[PDB]
Structures are given as structure tokens and as C-alpha cells.
Amino acid sequence: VETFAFQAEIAQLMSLIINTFYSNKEIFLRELISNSSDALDKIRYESLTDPSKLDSGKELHINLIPNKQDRTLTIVDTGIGMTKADLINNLGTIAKSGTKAFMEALQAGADISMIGQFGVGFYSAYLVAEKVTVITKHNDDEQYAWESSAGGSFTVRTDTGEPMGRGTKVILHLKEDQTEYLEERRIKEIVKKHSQFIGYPITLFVEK
Template identity: 50%
Template sequence: MTQTIHKETREFQAETKQLLDLMIHSIYTNKEIFLRELISNASDAIDKIKFESLTNQDLLEGDSNFEIFLIPDENTKTLTISDNGIGMTYDEVVENIGTIAKSGTKSFFEKLKEKETTTDNELIGQFGVGFYSAFMVSDKVTLITRAPGQEKGVKWESNGDGTYTIEECDKEKRGTTIIITLKEDFHAPSRPEENFLERYTIENLIKKYSDYIRYPIKMSFIKEEQPLDAEGKEIEDAPAAETVEIRTLNSMTPLWTRSKNELTKEEYQLFYKDLFHEWEDPMEYIHSKAEGTV
């Protein structure tokens, strides 16, 4: 029998507190990139279990349909990002979320001083602090995760005040779920471009930043259809019937299958960064197409 770990409150290390303060007080202008960072983390988690399952199929627990799922909820003002990747144990959550490697943090703050010549995108991704970008748009972040083979999951929660709570919890499926309770500024209907509960805003951000992610990024849409009569014609006065439609938001289409003429410089750069897990733009790129047999 495993020992139950009760809920406890811990403090972030000093460097993490400083980073959270920077995120919360918004040094970054391009706040929408938080979604790109969290989806990139989810993709990495799936990469990891896919690789490790090559030598241990039991890790999959019967679930090999890898995907990332987004759930915007108007009632709770939350945006949820879920994956069925490798997940984390209790100790891994403390190590990976509660702290940041000091060497990486030091480099981050050194680069921050040179921000005039460094973009938001480079800073956040380059030093492995992408998870914390969620605090730019949230009042509270909740993480629920379970590693394969573990009886219990782990629930981590913080409102960015320098402390976090961590406890065991029940979680049926392996993987990680991040629930972002959005600040009021980021679910205002009057500003659809920064309303991260607006499904079409989310869809556009996925196409902009995460279209080349190798796994399907899915989200449900409410579809309204007018009832039809016996002749197949719409019944005008009848209330529309609502159905739920699950859509895949990213194309998962490699650049080499598309025409050179329809691609932009930004698409080449984003594809390179995602494929090779790099944060700098490529020095140069060449697009060529050849046909024949090998």
C-alpha cells in the first residue's frame, strides 16, 4: 500500500518568484504566445511517451491515439489544455514546475536586460520558462497530471503569489491537463482578438503558431442547424438544434508537401523551430522539389 500524500503549500524558489512577478506584471506585449508554449509542452510530452513506449508498450495503457484537446468554458472563464503524453509523478511536478534551473534563469534575466534587441518569442521559449507564460493571462493556473503506472495523479495549483499547493488526486487517464482561469481582460467579448474563450480566436492562434505540431489539436464547436420538415425544407419558426462538432485545428502538413509559392518566410521559420526544437531563426533555407525513384 502506498502512503497518501496530503495537500501541502510550498514556496517557489527565489528565481521562480522573480520570473512569476515579471510574467504577472506583463513585461511581454505578445501575450497570445502562452498558448503556443503550452501546446509545445504538450507535444513534447507526447513525443516522450511515444519514444519510451517503443521499448515498453505497457506505458501506453491501451491508449495510443495521441492528441491535444482544448476546452474553453464561458461559465468558469477557464481555458483547458489536455494531452495524453507522458505525464508527471509527484516528485517530477515539484522538480519541473516548482523550480527552474538556476543556470537557465540567470541566462534568462541577462537576456532580459537586452530586451531591446530580443523578441518576446525568443525569450520565453529559449530558456524553458514557457509554462510560466500562462500567468500572463491568468488569475490562477491548475495542473493535473498522472504518469503511466501511477495509481494516483498529482494536482498543482498557484495564483502566482509566490506559493503553490500540491496534492495527490484521482486521474483516470495518463497525461497532463492545465486549467487556466483567465484574467478579466482576456475573456472580454468586446476584444475578440484577446478573448481566449472565443473559439475562432483560439483556432486562428493554432494556425498561426502551432499548425505543424505533429499531433491533432482538437476543440469542440457548437453547431446550430435548423430542423427540417418531411420534404427536407427548413422549418422557419422552429428553434435551431445544437450539435457538438469536434474539429482538428492544425493541418499537421509538412512544408515539403506544399507549393513554394504559397509559403511565407514566417512559416518556414516556425516549421524549422518546431521540427528541430530551436528558438533562433534559421540562417538560411532552401526549398527544392525533386521527383524520381531511389
């Protein structure tokens, strides 16, 4: 297990998201679905010139999996997945300018719902989650687990759990007061409201 510090700008963004009073929290799901859709677009495009890239799974989709027992909501996609360098370096550097611009906007009166327009909507996960675990598998690398409860650091390790094939699974460990996002009709309402134009199937797994 390796522990890393977030880029300073991102640690500051995370602390702001965690500490600011903001009731419109449902936007997190829209942002995570939009990120999955982007990862799905990338594998779909790559597969046009090299169909062997889908050997690890031909189905391109998004699953939403609430678990009231564990208090987690999982967003799974079969997109391109992330390499170790993506997890440690790349996502951070690509987010840096967006993060700085977003913090500046928040100063000039802009609101948290605009986070997506700056390309850093992933961190809106911390509106509802006390901890986020991400399991990922890219065709060119091993399966990894990323995890952060914020506070300035994240961890990366090789994942010895169930094999994913290809893609990314975001597991939100929800804050005690945010269990509404585990409810079937609330999830449907949110997806219909924000995510009605995504070009891949989004399937809600209903709890038994």
C-alpha cells in the same frame, strides 16, 4: 494539501510576467502546446521499446477546451504525465538555468516572446491567467493536482477527481480582461499561426 515555495528565480520570473505591460499575450498558447508535444514525444518514444506503457491510453493527442461560463481554457494532452517528484522538484531544477538566462536576456533588451527559447514558456500562462491548476497522471504514480496563483507559492495534493488515465491537463483561470482566448476563431487563429507544425492532432472542443 502541501504548500511549497517556488525557486527564487522562478518566483521573480513569475512576478515579472504578471506585472510587465505586454500586449502580445497569445504566445502562452503556443508555449503550452509545445510543452504538451514534448510530453507526447516522450511517451511515444518509451512505448517503442515497451508498448505496455500505452495500456493507460493509446491515443496521443492535444485537446483545447474553452469554457466561457467558468472563464477557463483547458489544454489537455495524453503525454507521459508527471510524478510527484516532477511537480515538486524536477521541473523546477530543470528550469533554473533557463530562468536565470531569460531574466538576463530581458535586461539586455530581449522581449517576452522569446521565453520559449529558454525552456520556461509554461510561465507565460500568467500573462492571461490569475490562477493555473494542473492535473496530471504518470504511469508510475498517482493522479495529482498542482495549483498556483503565483505570489511565490504553489500547492500539490492527491486528486480525487475524474480519472485521467495518463497525461496532463492545464487549466487556466483567465483574468477578466483576457476572455478573447475563449473565442473559437481566436483560438484557431493562434494555433494556425504558431503551432501549425506539431506532430499530434490538436482538437478544439467547441462550446454548445
